[PDB]
Amino acid sequence: GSSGSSGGPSRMRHERVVIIKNMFHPMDFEDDPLVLNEIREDLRVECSKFGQIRKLLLFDRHPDGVASVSFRDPEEADYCIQTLDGRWFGGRQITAQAWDGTTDYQSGPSSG
């Protein structure tokens, strides 16, 4: 630390999103919505245990069950990724991790 510009900007510059695998399947939603309902809400109630859910996005397209849980503070997520890496959804276990910005799960084509 040192004197200087003490203050000014009030924004965060770091990853604040987490991904989950083996939590759901795009085949369970085809039979009934509830599946996605309970699952989605579950991700919001699970990540809340530590704090709140700034935003949630369930990718009901990937056959490997992929979800994106946004967080407000990096302290929570970073800690929610290690505690959620062992969660169980639909009866099976799931993994957690911090996203960066390379996957094309929800993202789209940035051309034409």
Side-chain angles (χ1 to χ4, degrees):
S2 201
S3 285
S5 285
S6 277
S10 284
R11 67 271 279 284
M12 79 183 63
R13 294 160 59 175
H14 42 57
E15 290 53 79
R16 62 271 194 187
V17 181
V18 320
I19 315 309
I20 319 279
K21 268 65 179 282
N22 211 65
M23 56 158 304
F24 68 76
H25 207 270
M27 196 91 287
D28 276 321
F29 321 133
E30 301 270 296
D31 205 75
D32 270 277
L34 280 277
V35 180
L36 198 72
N37 276 299
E38 27 149 74
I39 292 161
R40 195 199 276 291
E41 92 203 34
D42 269 26
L43 267 181
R44 267 148 89 204
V45 322
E46 89 172 2
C47 295
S48 91
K49 306 303 176 149
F50 323 90
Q52 285 184 55
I53 330 306
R54 275 276 275 167
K55 163 161 201 153
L56 205 90
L57 309 161
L58 214 171
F59 307 160
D60 71 299
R61 311 296 268 179
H62 211 269
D64 208 334
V66 172
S68 203
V69 202
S70 182
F71 280 89
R72 172 61 180 199
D73 50 334
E75 305 197 292
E76 210 89 272
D78 191 270
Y79 176 24
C80 309
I81 80 86
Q82 42 174 272
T83 287
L84 294 171
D85 89 320
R87 282 273 85 193
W88 290 76
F89 277 51
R92 64 197 74 74
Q93 211 201 6
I94 83 190
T95 184
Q97 48 269 265
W99 185 52
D100 195 57
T102 161
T103 200
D104 289 83
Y105 300 139
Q106 74 88 238
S107 208
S110 193
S111 188

mmCIF file of all heavy atoms in Angstrom, residues 22-71:
data_model
loop_
_atom_site.group_PDB
_atom_site.id
_atom_site.type_symbol
_atom_site.label_atom_id
_atom_site.label_comp_id
_atom_site.label_asym_id
_atom_site.label_seq_id
_atom_site.Cartn_x
_atom_site.Cartn_y
_atom_site.Cartn_z
ATOM 1 N N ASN A 22 -22.533 -32.344 -15.143
ATOM 2 C CA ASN A 22 -23.239 -33.519 -14.645
ATOM 3 C C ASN A 22 -24.261 -33.130 -13.582
ATOM 4 O O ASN A 22 -24.280 -33.695 -12.489
ATOM 5 C CB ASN A 22 -22.245 -34.530 -14.068
ATOM 6 C CG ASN A 22 -22.724 -35.961 -14.218
ATOM 7 O OD1 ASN A 22 -22.858 -36.470 -15.331
ATOM 8 N ND2 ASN A 22 -22.985 -36.618 -13.094
ATOM 9 N N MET A 23 -25.108 -32.160 -13.911
ATOM 10 C CA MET A 23 -26.135 -31.696 -12.985
ATOM 11 C C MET A 23 -27.527 -31.882 -13.578
ATOM 12 O O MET A 23 -28.508 -32.036 -12.850
ATOM 13 C CB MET A 23 -25.908 -30.224 -12.636
ATOM 14 C CG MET A 23 -25.855 -29.313 -13.852
ATOM 15 S SD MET A 23 -26.223 -27.595 -13.448
ATOM 16 C CE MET A 23 -27.836 -27.764 -12.687
ATOM 17 N N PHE A 24 -27.606 -31.868 -14.905
ATOM 18 C CA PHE A 24 -28.880 -32.034 -15.596
ATOM 19 C C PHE A 24 -28.665 -32.568 -17.009
ATOM 20 O O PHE A 24 -27.532 -32.780 -17.441
ATOM 21 C CB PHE A 24 -29.632 -30.702 -15.651
ATOM 22 C CG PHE A 24 -28.973 -29.677 -16.530
ATOM 23 C CD1 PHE A 24 -29.064 -29.766 -17.910
ATOM 24 C CD2 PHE A 24 -28.262 -28.625 -15.976
ATOM 25 C CE1 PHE A 24 -28.459 -28.826 -18.720
ATOM 26 C CE2 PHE A 24 -27.655 -27.680 -16.782
ATOM 27 C CZ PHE A 24 -27.754 -27.780 -18.156
ATOM 28 N N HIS A 25 -29.764 -32.786 -17.726
ATOM 29 C CA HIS A 25 -29.697 -33.296 -19.091
ATOM 30 C C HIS A 25 -30.821 -32.715 -19.944
ATOM 31 O O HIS A 25 -31.958 -32.564 -19.496
ATOM 32 C CB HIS A 25 -29.779 -34.824 -19.092
ATOM 33 C CG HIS A 25 -29.103 -35.459 -20.267
ATOM 34 N ND1 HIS A 25 -29.752 -35.731 -21.452
ATOM 35 C CD2 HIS A 25 -27.825 -35.875 -20.434
ATOM 36 C CE1 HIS A 25 -28.904 -36.288 -22.298
ATOM 37 N NE2 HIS A 25 -27.728 -36.387 -21.706
ATOM 38 N N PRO A 26 -30.497 -32.380 -21.201
ATOM 39 C CA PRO A 26 -31.466 -31.809 -22.142
ATOM 40 C C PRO A 26 -32.516 -32.824 -22.580
ATOM 41 O O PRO A 26 -33.346 -32.539 -23.442
ATOM 42 C CB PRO A 26 -30.598 -31.390 -23.333
ATOM 43 C CG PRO A 26 -29.405 -32.279 -23.264
ATOM 44 C CD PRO A 26 -29.161 -32.531 -21.801
ATOM 45 N N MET A 27 -32.474 -34.009 -21.979
ATOM 46 C CA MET A 27 -33.424 -35.065 -22.306
ATOM 47 C C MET A 27 -34.505 -35.175 -21.235
ATOM 48 O O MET A 27 -35.580 -35.723 -21.479
ATOM 49 C CB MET A 27 -32.700 -36.404 -22.456
ATOM 50 C CG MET A 27 -33.525 -37.467 -23.162
ATOM 51 S SD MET A 27 -33.268 -37.474 -24.946
ATOM 52 C CE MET A 27 -34.145 -35.985 -25.420
ATOM 53 N N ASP A 28 -34.211 -34.653 -20.049
ATOM 54 C CA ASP A 28 -35.159 -34.693 -18.941
ATOM 55 C C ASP A 28 -36.205 -33.591 -19.081
ATOM 56 O O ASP A 28 -37.332 -33.726 -18.605
ATOM 57 C CB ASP A 28 -34.424 -34.547 -17.608
ATOM 58 C CG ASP A 28 -33.875 -35.868 -17.103
ATOM 59 O OD1 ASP A 28 -34.570 -36.895 -17.251
ATOM 60 O OD2 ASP A 28 -32.750 -35.874 -16.560
ATOM 61 N N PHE A 29 -35.823 -32.500 -19.738
ATOM 62 C CA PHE A 29 -36.728 -31.374 -19.939
ATOM 63 C C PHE A 29 -37.736 -31.677 -21.043
ATOM 64 O O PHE A 29 -38.837 -31.127 -21.059
ATOM 65 C CB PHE A 29 -35.935 -30.113 -20.289
ATOM 66 C CG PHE A 29 -34.656 -29.974 -19.513
ATOM 67 C CD1 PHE A 29 -33.472 -29.653 -20.156
ATOM 68 C CD2 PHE A 29 -34.639 -30.164 -18.140
ATOM 69 C CE1 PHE A 29 -32.293 -29.524 -19.445
ATOM 70 C CE2 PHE A 29 -33.464 -30.037 -17.425
ATOM 71 C CZ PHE A 29 -32.290 -29.717 -18.078
ATOM 72 N N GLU A 30 -37.350 -32.554 -21.964
ATOM 73 C CA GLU A 30 -38.221 -32.929 -23.072
ATOM 74 C C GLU A 30 -39.421 -33.729 -22.575
ATOM 75 O O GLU A 30 -40.493 -33.704 -23.182
ATOM 76 C CB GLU A 30 -37.444 -33.744 -24.107
ATOM 77 C CG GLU A 30 -36.243 -33.011 -24.684
ATOM 78 C CD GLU A 30 -36.589 -32.214 -25.927
ATOM 79 O OE1 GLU A 30 -36.971 -32.834 -26.941
ATOM 80 O OE2 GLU A 30 -36.479 -30.972 -25.885
ATOM 81 N N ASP A 31 -39.234 -34.439 -21.469
ATOM 82 C CA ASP A 31 -40.300 -35.248 -20.889
ATOM 83 C C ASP A 31 -41.156 -34.417 -19.937
ATOM 84 O O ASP A 31 -42.374 -34.581 -19.879
ATOM 85 C CB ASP A 31 -39.713 -36.450 -20.148
ATOM 86 C CG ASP A 31 -40.691 -37.604 -20.050
ATOM 87 O OD1 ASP A 31 -40.899 -38.295 -21.069
ATOM 88 O OD2 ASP A 31 -41.250 -37.816 -18.953
ATOM 89 N N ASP A 32 -40.508 -33.527 -19.193
ATOM 90 C CA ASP A 32 -41.210 -32.671 -18.243
ATOM 91 C C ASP A 32 -40.357 -31.461 -17.871
ATOM 92 O O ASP A 32 -39.143 -31.556 -17.699
ATOM 93 C CB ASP A 32 -41.574 -33.459 -16.985
ATOM 94 C CG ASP A 32 -42.941 -34.108 -17.083
ATOM 95 O OD1 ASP A 32 -43.947 -33.417 -16.823
ATOM 96 O OD2 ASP A 32 -43.003 -35.308 -17.422
ATOM 97 N N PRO A 33 -41.009 -30.295 -17.746
ATOM 98 C CA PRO A 33 -40.330 -29.044 -17.394
ATOM 99 C C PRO A 33 -39.839 -29.037 -15.951
ATOM 100 O O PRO A 33 -38.751 -28.538 -15.657
ATOM 101 C CB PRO A 33 -41.416 -27.983 -17.594
ATOM 102 C CG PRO A 33 -42.700 -28.718 -17.418
ATOM 103 C CD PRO A 33 -42.457 -30.108 -17.937
ATOM 104 N N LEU A 34 -40.646 -29.592 -15.054
ATOM 105 C CA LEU A 34 -40.291 -29.651 -13.640
ATOM 106 C C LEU A 34 -38.794 -29.884 -13.462
ATOM 107 O O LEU A 34 -38.133 -29.180 -12.698
ATOM 108 C CB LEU A 34 -41.078 -30.763 -12.943
ATOM 109 C CG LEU A 34 -42.522 -30.429 -12.565
ATOM 110 C CD1 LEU A 34 -42.568 -29.668 -11.250
ATOM 111 C CD2 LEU A 34 -43.190 -29.626 -13.672
ATOM 112 N N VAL A 35 -38.266 -30.874 -14.172
ATOM 113 C CA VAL A 35 -36.847 -31.197 -14.096
ATOM 114 C C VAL A 35 -35.993 -29.935 -14.127
ATOM 115 O O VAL A 35 -35.204 -29.683 -13.214
ATOM 116 C CB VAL A 35 -36.418 -32.121 -15.251
ATOM 117 C CG1 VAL A 35 -34.937 -32.456 -15.147
ATOM 118 C CG2 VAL A 35 -37.260 -33.389 -15.260
ATOM 119 N N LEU A 36 -36.156 -29.143 -15.181
ATOM 120 C CA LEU A 36 -35.401 -27.903 -15.331
ATOM 121 C C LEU A 36 -35.776 -26.902 -14.243
ATOM 122 O O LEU A 36 -34.933 -26.142 -13.767
ATOM 123 C CB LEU A 36 -35.652 -27.293 -16.711
ATOM 124 C CG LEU A 36 -34.637 -26.251 -17.179
ATOM 125 C CD1 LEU A 36 -33.313 -26.913 -17.527
ATOM 126 C CD2 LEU A 36 -35.178 -25.477 -18.373
ATOM 127 N N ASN A 37 -37.046 -26.908 -13.853
ATOM 128 C CA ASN A 37 -37.533 -26.000 -12.820
ATOM 129 C C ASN A 37 -36.801 -26.235 -11.502
ATOM 130 O O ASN A 37 -36.113 -25.348 -10.997
ATOM 131 C CB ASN A 37 -39.038 -26.184 -12.620
ATOM 132 C CG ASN A 37 -39.855 -25.383 -13.616
ATOM 133 O OD1 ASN A 37 -39.781 -24.155 -13.653
ATOM 134 N ND2 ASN A 37 -40.642 -26.077 -14.430
ATOM 135 N N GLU A 38 -36.955 -27.434 -10.951
ATOM 136 C CA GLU A 38 -36.309 -27.784 -9.691
ATOM 137 C C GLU A 38 -34.799 -27.583 -9.780
ATOM 138 O O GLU A 38 -34.175 -27.074 -8.849
ATOM 139 C CB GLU A 38 -36.621 -29.235 -9.319
ATOM 140 C CG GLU A 38 -36.902 -30.125 -10.519
ATOM 141 C CD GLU A 38 -36.469 -31.561 -10.294
ATOM 142 O OE1 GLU A 38 -37.154 -32.274 -9.532
ATOM 143 O OE2 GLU A 38 -35.445 -31.971 -10.880
ATOM 144 N N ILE A 39 -34.220 -27.987 -10.906
ATOM 145 C CA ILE A 39 -32.784 -27.850 -11.117
ATOM 146 C C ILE A 39 -32.358 -26.386 -11.071
ATOM 147 O O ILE A 39 -31.520 -25.999 -10.258
ATOM 148 C CB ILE A 39 -32.353 -28.457 -12.465
ATOM 149 C CG1 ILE A 39 -32.525 -29.977 -12.444
ATOM 150 C CG2 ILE A 39 -30.911 -28.086 -12.776
ATOM 151 C CD1 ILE A 39 -32.558 -30.600 -13.821
ATOM 152 N N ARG A 40 -32.943 -25.579 -11.948
ATOM 153 C CA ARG A 40 -32.625 -24.157 -12.008
ATOM 154 C C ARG A 40 -32.739 -23.516 -10.628
ATOM 155 O O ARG A 40 -31.768 -22.970 -10.105
ATOM 156 C CB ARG A 40 -33.555 -23.445 -12.991
ATOM 157 C CG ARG A 40 -33.073 -22.060 -13.394
ATOM 158 C CD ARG A 40 -34.205 -21.219 -13.962
ATOM 159 N NE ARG A 40 -34.426 -21.486 -15.381
ATOM 160 C CZ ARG A 40 -33.566 -21.145 -16.335
ATOM 161 N NH1 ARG A 40 -32.435 -20.527 -16.023
ATOM 162 N NH2 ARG A 40 -33.837 -21.422 -17.604
ATOM 163 N N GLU A 41 -33.931 -23.586 -10.045
ATOM 164 C CA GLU A 41 -34.172 -23.012 -8.726
ATOM 165 C C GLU A 41 -33.171 -23.548 -7.709
ATOM 166 O O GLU A 41 -32.739 -22.829 -6.807
ATOM 167 C CB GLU A 41 -35.598 -23.317 -8.265
ATOM 168 C CG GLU A 41 -35.715 -24.595 -7.451
ATOM 169 C CD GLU A 41 -37.115 -25.178 -7.478
ATOM 170 O OE1 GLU A 41 -37.790 -25.052 -8.520
ATOM 171 O OE2 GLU A 41 -37.534 -25.760 -6.455
ATOM 172 N N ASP A 42 -32.806 -24.817 -7.859
ATOM 173 C CA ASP A 42 -31.854 -25.452 -6.953
ATOM 174 C C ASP A 42 -30.504 -24.745 -7.002
ATOM 175 O O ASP A 42 -29.869 -24.525 -5.969
ATOM 176 C CB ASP A 42 -31.685 -26.929 -7.311
ATOM 177 C CG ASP A 42 -32.651 -27.822 -6.558
ATOM 178 O OD1 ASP A 42 -33.727 -27.329 -6.160
ATOM 179 O OD2 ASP A 42 -32.331 -29.014 -6.367
ATOM 180 N N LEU A 43 -30.070 -24.393 -8.206
ATOM 181 C CA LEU A 43 -28.792 -23.711 -8.390
ATOM 182 C C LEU A 43 -28.818 -22.326 -7.753
ATOM 183 O O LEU A 43 -27.795 -21.829 -7.281
ATOM 184 C CB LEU A 43 -28.464 -23.595 -9.880
ATOM 185 C CG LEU A 43 -27.599 -24.711 -10.465
ATOM 186 C CD1 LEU A 43 -27.338 -24.465 -11.943
ATOM 187 C CD2 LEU A 43 -26.287 -24.825 -9.702
ATOM 188 N N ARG A 44 -29.994 -21.707 -7.743
ATOM 189 C CA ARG A 44 -30.153 -20.378 -7.163
ATOM 190 C C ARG A 44 -30.208 -20.453 -5.640
ATOM 191 O O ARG A 44 -29.724 -19.558 -4.946
ATOM 192 C CB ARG A 44 -31.422 -19.713 -7.698
ATOM 193 C CG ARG A 44 -31.185 -18.841 -8.920
ATOM 194 C CD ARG A 44 -32.389 -18.844 -9.849
ATOM 195 N NE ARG A 44 -33.342 -17.790 -9.514
ATOM 196 C CZ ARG A 44 -34.632 -17.839 -9.828
ATOM 197 N NH1 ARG A 44 -35.120 -18.886 -10.479
ATOM 198 N NH2 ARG A 44 -35.437 -16.840 -9.488
ATOM 199 N N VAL A 45 -30.802 -21.525 -5.126
ATOM 200 C CA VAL A 45 -30.921 -21.717 -3.686
ATOM 201 C C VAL A 45 -29.636 -22.293 -3.101
ATOM 202 O O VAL A 45 -29.340 -22.102 -1.922
ATOM 203 C CB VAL A 45 -32.095 -22.652 -3.339
ATOM 204 C CG1 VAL A 45 -33.276 -22.392 -4.261
ATOM 205 C CG2 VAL A 45 -31.658 -24.107 -3.418
ATOM 206 N N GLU A 46 -28.877 -22.999 -3.934
ATOM 207 C CA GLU A 46 -27.624 -23.604 -3.497
ATOM 208 C C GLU A 46 -26.524 -22.553 -3.385
ATOM 209 O O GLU A 46 -25.798 -22.502 -2.392
ATOM 210 C CB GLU A 46 -27.197 -24.703 -4.472
ATOM 211 C CG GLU A 46 -26.332 -24.201 -5.616
ATOM 212 C CD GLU A 46 -25.754 -25.329 -6.449
ATOM 213 O OE1 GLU A 46 -26.064 -26.502 -6.155
ATOM 214 O OE2 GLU A 46 -24.990 -25.038 -7.393
ATOM 215 N N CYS A 47 -26.405 -21.716 -4.411
ATOM 216 C CA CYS A 47 -25.392 -20.667 -4.429
ATOM 217 C C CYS A 47 -25.717 -19.580 -3.410
ATOM 218 O O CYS A 47 -24.852 -18.788 -3.034
ATOM 219 C CB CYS A 47 -25.285 -20.056 -5.827
ATOM 220 S SG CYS A 47 -24.690 -21.205 -7.091
ATOM 221 N N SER A 48 -26.970 -19.547 -2.966
ATOM 222 C CA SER A 48 -27.411 -18.553 -1.994
ATOM 223 C C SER A 48 -26.890 -18.890 -0.600
ATOM 224 O O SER A 48 -26.613 -17.998 0.204
ATOM 225 C CB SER A 48 -28.938 -18.472 -1.974
ATOM 226 O OG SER A 48 -29.485 -19.367 -1.021
ATOM 227 N N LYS A 49 -26.760 -20.182 -0.320
ATOM 228 C CA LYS A 49 -26.270 -20.638 0.977
ATOM 229 C C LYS A 49 -25.110 -19.773 1.457
ATOM 230 O O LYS A 49 -24.972 -19.509 2.650
ATOM 231 C CB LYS A 49 -25.829 -22.101 0.892
ATOM 232 C CG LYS A 49 -26.902 -23.030 0.351
ATOM 233 C CD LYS A 49 -28.168 -22.965 1.190
ATOM 234 C CE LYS A 49 -29.278 -23.815 0.589
ATOM 235 N NZ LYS A 49 -30.186 -24.361 1.635
ATOM 236 N N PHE A 50 -24.279 -19.332 0.517
ATOM 237 C CA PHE A 50 -23.130 -18.495 0.845
ATOM 238 C C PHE A 50 -23.499 -17.016 0.779
ATOM 239 O O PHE A 50 -22.980 -16.201 1.541
ATOM 240 C CB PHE A 50 -21.972 -18.787 -0.112
ATOM 241 C CG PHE A 50 -21.856 -20.235 -0.488
ATOM 242 C CD1 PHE A 50 -22.522 -20.731 -1.599
ATOM 243 C CD2 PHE A 50 -21.082 -21.101 0.265
ATOM 244 C CE1 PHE A 50 -22.417 -22.064 -1.947
ATOM 245 C CE2 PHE A 50 -20.973 -22.436 -0.079
ATOM 246 C CZ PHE A 50 -21.641 -22.917 -1.187
ATOM 247 N N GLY A 51 -24.400 -16.676 -0.138
ATOM 248 C CA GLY A 51 -24.822 -15.296 -0.288
ATOM 249 C C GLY A 51 -26.073 -15.161 -1.135
ATOM 250 O O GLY A 51 -27.148 -15.609 -0.739
ATOM 251 N N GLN A 52 -25.931 -14.540 -2.301
ATOM 252 C CA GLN A 52 -27.059 -14.345 -3.204
ATOM 253 C C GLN A 52 -26.692 -14.746 -4.629
ATOM 254 O O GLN A 52 -25.528 -15.016 -4.927
ATOM 255 C CB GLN A 52 -27.517 -12.886 -3.175
ATOM 256 C CG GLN A 52 -28.302 -12.519 -1.926
ATOM 257 C CD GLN A 52 -28.823 -11.096 -1.960
ATOM 258 O OE1 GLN A 52 -29.516 -10.698 -2.898
ATOM 259 N NE2 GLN A 52 -28.491 -10.318 -0.936
ATOM 260 N N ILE A 53 -27.691 -14.785 -5.503
ATOM 261 C CA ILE A 53 -27.472 -15.153 -6.897
ATOM 262 C C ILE A 53 -27.690 -13.960 -7.821
ATOM 263 O O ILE A 53 -28.813 -13.687 -8.245
ATOM 264 C CB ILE A 53 -28.404 -16.300 -7.329
ATOM 265 C CG1 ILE A 53 -28.737 -17.195 -6.133
ATOM 266 C CG2 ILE A 53 -27.762 -17.114 -8.442
ATOM 267 C CD1 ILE A 53 -27.515 -17.715 -5.409
ATOM 268 N N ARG A 54 -26.607 -13.254 -8.132
ATOM 269 C CA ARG A 54 -26.680 -12.091 -9.006
ATOM 270 C C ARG A 54 -27.425 -12.425 -10.296
ATOM 271 O O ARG A 54 -28.176 -11.605 -10.822
ATOM 272 C CB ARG A 54 -25.274 -11.584 -9.335
ATOM 273 C CG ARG A 54 -24.708 -10.640 -8.287
ATOM 274 C CD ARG A 54 -25.184 -9.213 -8.507
ATOM 275 N NE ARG A 54 -24.352 -8.500 -9.473
ATOM 276 C CZ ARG A 54 -24.691 -7.337 -10.017
ATOM 277 N NH1 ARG A 54 -25.838 -6.757 -9.690
ATOM 278 N NH2 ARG A 54 -23.881 -6.750 -10.888
ATOM 279 N N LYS A 55 -27.210 -13.636 -10.800
ATOM 280 C CA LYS A 55 -27.861 -14.081 -12.026
ATOM 281 C C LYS A 55 -27.640 -15.573 -12.248
ATOM 282 O O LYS A 55 -26.612 -16.125 -11.854
ATOM 283 C CB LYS A 55 -27.329 -13.292 -13.226
ATOM 284 C CG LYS A 55 -27.638 -13.939 -14.564
ATOM 285 C CD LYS A 55 -27.523 -12.942 -15.705
ATOM 286 C CE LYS A 55 -28.299 -13.403 -16.929
ATOM 287 N NZ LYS A 55 -28.741 -12.256 -17.770
ATOM 288 N N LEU A 56 -28.610 -16.223 -12.883
ATOM 289 C CA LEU A 56 -28.521 -17.652 -13.159
ATOM 290 C C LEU A 56 -28.877 -17.949 -14.612
ATOM 291 O O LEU A 56 -29.789 -17.343 -15.176
ATOM 292 C CB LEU A 56 -29.448 -18.431 -12.225
ATOM 293 C CG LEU A 56 -29.059 -19.884 -11.951
ATOM 294 C CD1 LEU A 56 -28.152 -19.973 -10.734
ATOM 295 C CD2 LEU A 56 -30.301 -20.742 -11.757
ATOM 296 N N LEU A 57 -28.154 -18.887 -15.214
ATOM 297 C CA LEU A 57 -28.395 -19.267 -16.601
ATOM 298 C C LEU A 57 -28.190 -20.766 -16.799
ATOM 299 O O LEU A 57 -27.061 -21.259 -16.761
ATOM 300 C CB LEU A 57 -27.468 -18.486 -17.534
ATOM 301 C CG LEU A 57 -27.454 -16.968 -17.349
ATOM 302 C CD1 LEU A 57 -26.202 -16.367 -17.969
ATOM 303 C CD2 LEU A 57 -28.703 -16.346 -17.956
ATOM 304 N N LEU A 58 -29.286 -21.485 -17.014
ATOM 305 C CA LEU A 58 -29.227 -22.928 -17.221
ATOM 306 C C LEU A 58 -29.212 -23.265 -18.708
ATOM 307 O O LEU A 58 -30.153 -22.951 -19.435
ATOM 308 C CB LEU A 58 -30.416 -23.609 -16.543
ATOM 309 C CG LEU A 58 -30.153 -24.999 -15.963
ATOM 310 C CD1 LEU A 58 -31.339 -25.464 -15.131
ATOM 311 C CD2 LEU A 58 -29.855 -25.994 -17.074
ATOM 312 N N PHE A 59 -28.137 -23.907 -19.153
ATOM 313 C CA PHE A 59 -27.999 -24.288 -20.554
ATOM 314 C C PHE A 59 -28.686 -25.624 -20.824
ATOM 315 O O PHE A 59 -28.051 -26.678 -20.794
ATOM 316 C CB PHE A 59 -26.521 -24.375 -20.938
ATOM 317 C CG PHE A 59 -25.739 -23.138 -20.598
ATOM 318 C CD1 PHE A 59 -24.360 -23.185 -20.481
ATOM 319 C CD2 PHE A 59 -26.384 -21.929 -20.398
ATOM 320 C CE1 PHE A 59 -23.638 -22.049 -20.167
ATOM 321 C CE2 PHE A 59 -25.668 -20.788 -20.084
ATOM 322 C CZ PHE A 59 -24.293 -20.849 -19.970
ATOM 323 N N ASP A 60 -29.987 -25.570 -21.088
ATOM 324 C CA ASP A 60 -30.761 -26.774 -21.365
ATOM 325 C C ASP A 60 -30.554 -27.236 -22.804
ATOM 326 O O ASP A 60 -31.505 -27.614 -23.488
ATOM 327 C CB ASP A 60 -32.248 -26.522 -21.106
ATOM 328 C CG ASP A 60 -32.870 -25.616 -22.150
ATOM 329 O OD1 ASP A 60 -32.417 -24.460 -22.279
ATOM 330 O OD2 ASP A 60 -33.813 -26.063 -22.837
ATOM 331 N N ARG A 61 -29.305 -27.202 -23.256
ATOM 332 C CA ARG A 61 -28.973 -27.614 -24.614
ATOM 333 C C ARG A 61 -27.801 -28.591 -24.615
ATOM 334 O O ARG A 61 -27.730 -29.492 -25.453
ATOM 335 C CB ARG A 61 -28.633 -26.393 -25.472
ATOM 336 C CG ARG A 61 -29.649 -25.268 -25.361
ATOM 337 C CD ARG A 61 -31.011 -25.695 -25.884
ATOM 338 N NE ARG A 61 -31.175 -25.384 -27.302
ATOM 339 C CZ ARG A 61 -32.267 -25.679 -27.998
ATOM 340 N NH1 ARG A 61 -33.288 -26.287 -27.410
ATOM 341 N NH2 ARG A 61 -32.340 -25.363 -29.285
ATOM 342 N N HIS A 62 -26.884 -28.408 -23.671
ATOM 343 C CA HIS A 62 -25.715 -29.274 -23.562
ATOM 344 C C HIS A 62 -26.085 -30.608 -22.922
ATOM 345 O O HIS A 62 -26.643 -30.664 -21.826
ATOM 346 C CB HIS A 62 -24.621 -28.588 -22.745
ATOM 347 C CG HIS A 62 -23.233 -28.968 -23.162
ATOM 348 N ND1 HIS A 62 -22.543 -30.026 -22.609
ATOM 349 C CD2 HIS A 62 -22.408 -28.425 -24.087
ATOM 350 C CE1 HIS A 62 -21.353 -30.116 -23.175
ATOM 351 N NE2 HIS A 62 -21.246 -29.156 -24.076
ATOM 352 N N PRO A 63 -25.768 -31.709 -23.620
ATOM 353 C CA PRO A 63 -26.059 -33.063 -23.139
ATOM 354 C C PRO A 63 -25.193 -33.452 -21.946
ATOM 355 O O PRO A 63 -25.268 -34.577 -21.453
ATOM 356 C CB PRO A 63 -25.732 -33.946 -24.346
ATOM 357 C CG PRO A 63 -24.739 -33.162 -25.132
ATOM 358 C CD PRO A 63 -25.101 -31.716 -24.933
ATOM 359 N N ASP A 64 -24.372 -32.514 -21.486
ATOM 360 C CA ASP A 64 -23.492 -32.759 -20.348
ATOM 361 C C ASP A 64 -23.888 -31.890 -19.159
ATOM 362 O O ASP A 64 -23.092 -31.666 -18.248
ATOM 363 C CB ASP A 64 -22.037 -32.486 -20.733
ATOM 364 C CG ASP A 64 -21.059 -33.321 -19.931
ATOM 365 O OD1 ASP A 64 -21.408 -33.719 -18.800
ATOM 366 O OD2 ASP A 64 -19.944 -33.577 -20.433
ATOM 367 N N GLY A 65 -25.124 -31.401 -19.174
ATOM 368 C CA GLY A 65 -25.604 -30.561 -18.093
ATOM 369 C C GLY A 65 -24.637 -29.444 -17.754
ATOM 370 O O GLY A 65 -23.677 -29.647 -17.010
ATOM 371 N N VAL A 66 -24.888 -28.259 -18.302
ATOM 372 C CA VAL A 66 -24.032 -27.105 -18.055
ATOM 373 C C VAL A 66 -24.849 -25.903 -17.596
ATOM 374 O O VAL A 66 -25.809 -25.503 -18.255
ATOM 375 C CB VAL A 66 -23.234 -26.718 -19.314
ATOM 376 C CG1 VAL A 66 -22.511 -25.396 -19.103
ATOM 377 C CG2 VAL A 66 -22.252 -27.820 -19.681
ATOM 378 N N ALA A 67 -24.463 -25.331 -16.460
ATOM 379 C CA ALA A 67 -25.159 -24.172 -15.913
ATOM 380 C C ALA A 67 -24.176 -23.069 -15.538
ATOM 381 O O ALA A 67 -23.018 -23.338 -15.219
ATOM 382 C CB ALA A 67 -25.988 -24.577 -14.704
ATOM 383 N N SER A 68 -24.645 -21.826 -15.578
ATOM 384 C CA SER A 68 -23.806 -20.680 -15.247
ATOM 385 C C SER A 68 -24.421 -19.865 -14.114
ATOM 386 O O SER A 68 -25.489 -19.272 -14.270
ATOM 387 C CB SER A 68 -23.605 -19.794 -16.478
ATOM 388 O OG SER A 68 -22.430 -19.013 -16.359
ATOM 389 N N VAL A 69 -23.740 -19.841 -12.973
ATOM 390 C CA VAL A 69 -24.218 -19.098 -11.813
ATOM 391 C C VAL A 69 -23.356 -17.868 -11.553
ATOM 392 O O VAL A 69 -22.197 -17.983 -11.155
ATOM 393 C CB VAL A 69 -24.231 -19.978 -10.549
ATOM 394 C CG1 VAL A 69 -25.194 -19.414 -9.516
ATOM 395 C CG2 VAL A 69 -24.596 -21.412 -10.903
ATOM 396 N N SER A 70 -23.929 -16.691 -11.782
ATOM 397 C CA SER A 70 -23.210 -15.438 -11.576
ATOM 398 C C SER A 70 -23.207 -15.050 -10.102
ATOM 399 O O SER A 70 -24.157 -15.332 -9.372
ATOM 400 C CB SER A 70 -23.843 -14.320 -12.408
ATOM 401 O OG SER A 70 -23.128 -13.107 -12.259
ATOM 402 N N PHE A 71 -22.130 -14.401 -9.670
ATOM 403 C CA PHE A 71 -22.000 -13.974 -8.281
ATOM 404 C C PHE A 71 -21.659 -12.489 -8.199
ATOM 405 O O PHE A 71 -21.115 -11.913 -9.140
ATOM 406 C CB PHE A 71 -20.924 -14.797 -7.571
ATOM 407 C CG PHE A 71 -21.397 -16.153 -7.133
ATOM 408 C CD1 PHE A 71 -21.305 -17.242 -7.984
ATOM 409 C CD2 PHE A 71 -21.932 -16.340 -5.869
ATOM 410 C CE1 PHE A 71 -21.741 -18.491 -7.584
ATOM 411 C CE2 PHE A 71 -22.369 -17.587 -5.462
ATOM 412 C CZ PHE A 71 -22.272 -18.664 -6.321
#
